[PDB]
Amino acid sequence: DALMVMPFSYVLKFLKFIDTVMQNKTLLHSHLPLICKNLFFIIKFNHKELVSQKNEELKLQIN
Amino acid sequence: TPVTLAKVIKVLGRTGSRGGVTQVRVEFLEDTSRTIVRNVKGPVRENDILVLMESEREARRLR
């Protein structure tokens, strides 16, 4: 319900946060399940508008 | 003063809004990408059109 409440600007901020986690790899492995579940749920909700967006920073971040 | 028509998609739940004010997510109609979180006043259901006067201001909680 929380991840459904937040809007798309905060979705983008969330993706930037997960990028910073992947750079801080030990947080990633210590909290690997939760991060995966939240990321996949946010993208499954917001897939339409996120794929509507055209942004090379989004492309590189998601890569 | 251009009014915009948006389309209620998802009636948000577990958000604590005041009695009689229901939060909602809308997709723009003339542009099939953008989504905006807004508040309504009466009875509202999914997939139905809503008239926005000030289109860019995203809605916050009402405690």
Binding site: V5, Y10 | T15, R61
Partner: peptide, 11 residues
């Protein structure tokens, strides 16, 4: 007291 969702948004 902000709900979950609101607290995640502020943080």
């Amino acid at each position: 007291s902000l709900k979950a969702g609101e607290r995640l948004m502020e943080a």
